[PDB]
């Protein structure tokens, strides 16, 4: 039974394996030979948000491109104003070890979660006075790695017991359940129209899903180690991926296979965060030798370097209009770059 | 016009800043511990003697926050980066024991846990050595060097037990020490103990060793130790 069914899955791999070999007309370096390059560019640290005690794990930008949230391991959840460097709110937490933070695109709710296995939802509007816990979500059994809001009523969450989930905030129960992976799920990136999303996990695979069906559409495999970060292209057909074997890759949803691989011999440390710029030309790749290296996305050349940190970077965001880049590392300092 | 929101952005800032200066001082006054020991009796007895069980307790008016890791999966490479800043890892123990040694090797040789110190316990030493000394077969088919092993004379063996329990009790203790001493280089230590039967000084041996780790840490910051 299992002997010929392993071969049946093997032959369905192998037929899939040569269909992408059928599609491979040429490499993308051959068609991007004559793109005149971006070349010698660089940035500068403009701000430094220094208010946290312990290490910073996650930040998320705002739809105004002005506010941002910082979650850190001291049990503090802190909203900033990036323009005037002012702490708008300083939320205390229930449990300390948090790993992810959410900022709803309505600007009206904030979530965070970690090893106490609960995504908690915090209200920002709070006309009764100070902020408080609105409701919280307890369905996962592993830990809690990522989360991304859709409206003020549903949020997709990424966990460590392999299962992603879509939630209903008023009734507190999960709507669907995503059971495709095998490892700890690490990060998920929403499509720009919130019709799809991809997710990376520790089993070196990248699953593309459907929010309405709860099913896995495609499986992307081009990495060698566990994957820490993922981020869509701005249109919705590509994503970049960062894994712990020091390589960034590019996978297109149409041709169903990989396109580019961003590596260099001197970088042999793992990747913790990636994000795209607004056009898509500049790809950012937070590293473990403590410097965010700006990678070209069409020519695979590390054109720019941001080198201002003391410890490992852990989170990296780009404003939705492309004015600023904020990176936060384990030294409790969040240099806003520009 | 624009000064009106400015002072509110000032007055919210200073009222927040006063709360942080309550929180930084209490955070520097409390020591976190990690209790990743793979033993069900060990993880629960040393409490008296969800996703995470927070136990807090004070001794000599010093605040400890002890954190048992509970509802997690068996893979560990992604949630022990959330503990590099801790004071002391309390590795409790219960082939079980080669898998115990293979785990303690990885923690000592992590890129991020390279600088954190390990307090090591030896649970059940009465019911893991004399259990073999009634069976006379279990260490030898787990270890060949035990028949070669001599009890070190600079040990302080307790009078009133089987001396060949203490032959194996010190053998296991000297099997963790050969991993910790080999290529650790002065930035993190190991502290073997065993109480495991009474409420007396399970925590005090942790107390008098957590006090040590900080003292090695400050003398590390002066190029002395």
């Amino acid at each position, epitope marked *: 039974e299992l002997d010929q069914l392993r071969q049946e899955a093997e032959q369905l791999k192998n037929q899939i394996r040569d269909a992408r070999k059928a599609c491979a007309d040429a490499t993308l370096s051959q068609i991007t030979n004559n793109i005149d390059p971006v070349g010698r560019i660089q940035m500068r640290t403009r701000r430094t948000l220094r208010g946290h005690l312990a290490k910073i794990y996650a930040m998320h930008w705002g739809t105004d491109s002005r506010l941002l949230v910082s979650a850190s391991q001291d049990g503090k959840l802190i909203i900033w104003d990036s323009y005037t460097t002012n702490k708008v709110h300083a939320i205390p937490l229930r449990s300390s070890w948090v790993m992810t933070c959410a900022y709803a695109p309505s600007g009206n709710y904030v979530a965070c979660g970690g090893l106490d296995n609960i995504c908690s939802i915090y209200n920002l509007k709070t006309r009764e006075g100070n902020v408080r816990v609105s409701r919280e979500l307890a369905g996962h059994t592993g830990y809690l790695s990522c989360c991304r809001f859709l409206d003020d009523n549903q949020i997709v969450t990424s966990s460590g017991d392999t299962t992603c989930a879509l939630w209903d905030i008023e009734t507190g129960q999960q709507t669907t359940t995503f059971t495709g992976h*095998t*490892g700890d799920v690490m990060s998920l990136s929403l499509a720009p129209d919130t019709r799809l999303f991809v997710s990376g996990a*520790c*089993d*070196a695979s990248a699953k593309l899903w459907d929010v309405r069906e709860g099913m896995c559409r495609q499986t992307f*495999t*081009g990495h*060698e*180690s*566990d994957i820490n970060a993922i981020c869509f292209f701005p249109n919705g057909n590509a994503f970049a991926t960062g894994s*712990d*074997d*020091a390589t960034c890759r590019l996978f297109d949803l149409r041709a169903d296979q990989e396109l580019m691989t961003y590596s260099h011999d001197n970088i*042999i440390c*793992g990747i913790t965060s990636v994000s795209f710029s607004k056009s898509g030309r500049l790809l950012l790749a937070g590293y473990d030798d403590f410097n965010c290296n700006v990678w070209d996305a069409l020519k695979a050349d590390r054109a720019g370097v941001l080198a201002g940190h003391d410890n490992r970077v852990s989170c990296l965001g780009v404003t939705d209009d492309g004015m600023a880049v904020a990176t936060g590392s384990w030294d409790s300092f969040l240099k806003i770059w520009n | 016009d624009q000064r009106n929101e400015e002072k509110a952005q000032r007055e919210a800032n200073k009222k927040i800043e006063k709360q942080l200066q309550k929180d930084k001082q209490v955070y520097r006054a409390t020591h976190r511990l990690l209790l990743l020991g793979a033993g069900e009796s060990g993880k629960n007895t040393i409490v008296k003697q969800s996703g995470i069980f927070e136990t807090k307790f004070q001794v000599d008016k010093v605040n400890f926050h002890m954190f048992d890791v509970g509802a997690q*999966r*068996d*893979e*560990r*490479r992604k949630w022990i980066q959330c503990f590099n800043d801790v004071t002391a890892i309390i590795f409790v123990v219960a*082939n079980r024991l*080669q*898998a115990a040694l*293979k*785990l303690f*090797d*990885s*923690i000592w*040789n*992590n*890129k991020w846990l390279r600088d954190t110190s390990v307090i090591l316990f030896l649970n059940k030493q009465d019911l893991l050595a004399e259990k073999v000394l009634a069976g006379k077969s279990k260490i030898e*088919d*787990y*270890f*060949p*060097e035990f028949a070669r092993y001599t009890t070190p004379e600079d040990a302080t063996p307790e009078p009133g037990e089987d001396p060949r329990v203490t032959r194996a009790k010190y053998f296991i203790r000297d099997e963790f020490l050969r991993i910790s001493t080999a290529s650790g280089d002065g930035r993190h230590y190991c502290y073997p103990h065993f109480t495991c039967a009474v409420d007396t000084e399970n925590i005090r041996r942790v107390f008098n060793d957590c006090r040590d780790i900080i003292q090695r840490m400050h003398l590390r910051q002066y190029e002395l130790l």
Partner: nanobody, 126 residues
Framework: QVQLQESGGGLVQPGGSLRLSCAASGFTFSNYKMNWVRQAPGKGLEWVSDISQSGASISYTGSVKGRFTISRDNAKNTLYLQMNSLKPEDTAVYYC?????????????????????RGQGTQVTV
């Protein structure tokens, strides 16, 4: 895509000898500290051996010390475990594994429950 194919195994009279192989796929073989893991029936998984990148560091389990050996080939990207003087109680499913990251020392892969950088294994009997 990475995948691991162990080969060999089968039957032996109690006391014989055997080798094993590990077919690698799709990664830089010269980077990863690799290892063997067995699992007896009726019991959980247990660690057998390991070899480093070059082949300098080599360690074993105490029960199987001396009688076995491990060797790697960083030119033809396969892993080799030659076993000698086999036992009646060594009958177990033998997997080939890889520690999850390049250029390191630590490993966290003795577990069951899809450590997804191990192969499905081969059966050795006696």
């Amino acid at each position: 895509q990475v995948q691991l194919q162990e080969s060999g195994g089968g039957l032996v009279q109690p006391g014989g000898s055997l080798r094993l192989s590990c077919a690698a796929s799709g990664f830089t073989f010269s980077n990863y500290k690799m290892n063997w893991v067995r699992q007896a029936p009726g019991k959980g998984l247990e660690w057998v051996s390991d070899i480093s990148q070059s082949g300098a560091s080599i360690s074993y389990t105490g029960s199987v010390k001396g009688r076995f050996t491990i060797s790697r080939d960083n030119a033809k990207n396969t892993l080799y475990l030659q076993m000698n003087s086999l036992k009646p109680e060594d009958t177990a499913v033998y997997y080939c594994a890889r520690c999850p990251a390049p250029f390191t020392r630590d490993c966290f892969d003795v577990t069951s429950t899809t450590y997804a950088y191990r192969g499905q294994g081969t059966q050795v009997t006696v």
